[PDB]
Amino acid sequence: NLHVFTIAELRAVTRDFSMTNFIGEGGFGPVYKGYVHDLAAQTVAVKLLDLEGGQGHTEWQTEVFFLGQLRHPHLVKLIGYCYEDEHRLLVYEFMTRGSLEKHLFSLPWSTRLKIAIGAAKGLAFLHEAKPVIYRDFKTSNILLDSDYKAKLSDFGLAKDGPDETHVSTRVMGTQGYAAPEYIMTGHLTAKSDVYGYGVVLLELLSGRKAVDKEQSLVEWARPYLTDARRLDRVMDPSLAGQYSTRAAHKAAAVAHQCVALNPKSRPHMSAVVDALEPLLA
Ligand SMILES: Nc1ncnc2c1ncn2[C@@H]1O[C@H](COP(=O)(O)OP(=O)(O)OP(=O)(O)O)[C@@H](O)[C@H]1O
Ligand SMILES: [Mg+2]
Structure with missing residues (x-):
């Protein structure tokens, strides 16, 4: 052991x-x-x-x-x-390529999809178990090995899941990634993790940080993610010609559903894996 x-x-x-x-x-x-x-x-x-x-x-x-x-x-x-x-x-x-936030703040579109799929599989595994709520899902907690395989790390704020519907605990986490319904109520669910995953996906798609003092990436890019015609306003300019319109639009729509402010609207992480995996083909 x-x-x-x-x-x-x-x-x-x-x-x-x-x-x-x-x-x-x-x-x-x-x-x-x-x-x-x-x-x-x-x-x-x-x-x-x-x-x-x-x-x-x-x-x-x-x-x-x-x-x-x-x-x-x-x-x-x-x-x-x-x-x-x-x-x-x-x-x-030792994860040889360190944490994702240092690479993002250059990364190929195919590499970013691979990271987003790997992180989603890690999170789906925690939610489908003795379910575990990751709680602090942020960019800097995704580590990378030599092939840019992505692994969830740092389970300092990890908590056991709820006949209960939520877990009552202190508000802990990082501004911009912590779920808004959790911040405002102290009620934590696995859907709270999906919001933070959506934020990281947003960061991978746009190259922008979740919070940068237009300061909030989610609030600013929120209304632009549903329309494939508006992709140019959210997609990282360093990603140009690497993605098909369909792949980026579907990733953007997955992000949009994950950062919904109604937690009941967010997808299960296993559905996120199923939406994103084909985009790599
Ligand atoms: N296994 C590892 N391989 C390579 N680098 C690592 C590893 N673990 C940590 N690091 C580097 O050190 C940083 C801090 O590690 P970690 O996130 O575990 O610290 P922490 O103090 O628990 O963070 P937090 O403030 O989120 O609680 C990581 O973001 C990463 O850059
Ligand atoms: Mg920690």
């Missing part, structure tokens, strides 16, 4: 958390490239809890719980963890 590491071992693994091994960070803490020697030898990612930050043991234990039981091809693999006095660390497989 999961391997238990010591601080001393992760110090060896990451060249004592050298700044040259820095590969990214978030609200939990910074992440360092590392190498495990003869568990097979491989390049790993080591995430360290920042003890002055806004996160802590709860997010750590959530990832260990969910990633230690969840195994799918579009989900990042958790190799092990460290729990040593006040310190908390997480060890994942």
Whole structure:
């Protein structure tokens, strides 16, 4: 199952958390490239809890719980963890192309479709199970391997699904991706995840960030997604001649349904996979 590491071992693994091994960070803490020697030898990612930050043991234990039981091809693999006095660390497989937001903010139309399909399969797997609500579905939580295969990562805010119709919890997440009905009510469902997936799809189609202080991508591009004649106002100009009108229009319409403000109008993620997969043919 999961391997238990010591601080001393992760110090060896990451060249004592050298700044040259820095590969990214978030609200939990910074992440360092590392190498495990003869568990097979491989390049790993080591995430360290920042003890002055806004996160802590709860997010750590959530990832260990969910990633230690969840195994799918579009989900990042958790190799092990460290729990040593006040310190908390997480060890994942190294995703060689990092997180999607750094590539988006150049990416071929076919590559973007492939990323959107892979991320959708990961999310569909969580929803169809013991269903799991991803909650923090955003661009920077999609990681990429050498072939740009997309994998969901960072299950710090992951929650179990509801005879109930919703889950009552704190409003947590990231502006622009968190579902509006969830923000306003504190009621979380799997349909809340579909809104954030729609936002990421919107970002892949337009090259624009969800929020940029016209500041909100969804609100601005919302009325332009249903009409194939208006595609030029939403499609990334760096994507020109790469897509057929039908493929971009169907992707745009899928995005539009996913960012509906009525959660009952959003599609199931498995229907999203079925709409998008043919576009790659
Ligand atoms: N397995 C990995 N392979 C390559 N890079 C990674 C990996 N895990 C994390 N990173 C890099 O470090 C960044 C931060 O990781 P992660 O999203 O897990 O941090 P976090 O603090 O939990 O973020 P949040 O603030 O959303 O909670 C990632 O977006 C990614 O760029
Ligand atoms: Mg996190």
